[PDB]
Amino acid sequence: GKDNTKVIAHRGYWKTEGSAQNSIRSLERASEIGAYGSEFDVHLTADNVLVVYHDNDIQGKHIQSCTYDELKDLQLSNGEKLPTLEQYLKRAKKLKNIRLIFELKSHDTPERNRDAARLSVQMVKRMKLAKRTDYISFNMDACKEFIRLCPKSEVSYLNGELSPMELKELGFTGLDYHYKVLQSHPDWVKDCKVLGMTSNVWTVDDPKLMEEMIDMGVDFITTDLPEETQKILHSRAQ
């Protein structure tokens, strides 16, 4: 029957010429290929500036305890400067076709996670992107604050241990779980459907596994090879 699986470019479309994880180029290239969404990772600096980067440390600097001034001139793998979230969102605003899959990274206390989530929602709001921005996090305190602040927004849990029923009760609108969790709990995708929630799986790059997850009926696949997933979905729709 009909596949209902859409493609999320993990860290943007970075496995392509001139691109880099979590970059302006990767966001642009995700849009250029027509992916459903582009995922990116967000930290709050010591001085409350939101920046875009996966790892907790960049070139020996721990992002969450450093000021933005210490970090601002550090370069990505393609020579771009470390993006501010504001810069990321200014570019995303002109890219109309694409959903923004905003991962808030885990912060150092529950209260700091709440602060990072509040400031994230404020930035998304002032940049006029609340309609196109979905939140994901490993951190439960961050997720709960996004749910509280944005009851009509999409919020999915990353960490893998809560059933869809448990997530629905907390006000989540989806799960976004490691593929092995969904292999270990093969009924959770169906339960999400029954519960009116979305299912997302990360980070799936092997073609046999993409097929397995599409067969299971995941709403989204988060991948470092987004064009391969698109090809597979196109061939299957023939």
Binding footprint of Mg ion on the chain (CB under 5 A) = 1, 41, 103
Annotated binding site for Mg(2+): 39, 41, 103
Rg, C-alpha atoms of the chain: 17
Minimum CB distance to Mg ion smaller for 105 or for 144: 105
Q: Report the C-alpha gap between 182 and 205 in whole angstroms.
A: 15
User: What are the backbone dihedrals phi and psi of residue 220, each rounded to the nearest 5 degrees, phi first?
Assistant: -135, 145
Is the peptide bond preceding residue 84 cis, with omega within 30 degrees of 0? no
Cβ at position 208, least distance to Mg ion in Å: 17
Cβ at position 74, least distance to Mg ion in Å: 19
Minimum CB distance to Mg ion smaller for 80 or for 165: 80
Cβ at position 236, least distance to Mg ion in Å: 7
Is residue 145 helix, strand or coil?
helix
Residue nearest to Mg ion (CB): 103
Minimum CB distance to Mg ion smaller for 103 or for 134: 103
Q: Taking CA 129 as the corner, what is the angle to CA 4 and CA 157, rounded to the nearest 5 degrees? A: 55
Cβ at position 165, least distance to Mg ion in Å: 25
Minimum CB distance to Mg ion smaller for 42 or for 197: 42
Q: Are the CB atoms for 238 and 231 separated by under 8 Å?
A: no
Output the six-digit token pair for 25. 């180029």
Q: Report the C-alpha gap between 204 and 179 in whole angstroms.
A: 7
Cβ at position 134, least distance to Mg ion in Å: 13
User: What are the backbone dihedrals phi and psi of residue 31, each rounded to the nearest 5 degrees, phi first?
Assistant: -60, -45
Q: Report the C-alpha gap between 153 and 155 in whole angstroms.
A: 6
Query: Where are the extended beta strands (E) located within the chain?
Result: 6-9, 37-44, 50-52, 57-58, 61-62, 99-104, 133-137, 155-157, 174-178, 198-202, 220-223
Minimum CB distance to Mg ion smaller for 1 or for 186: 1
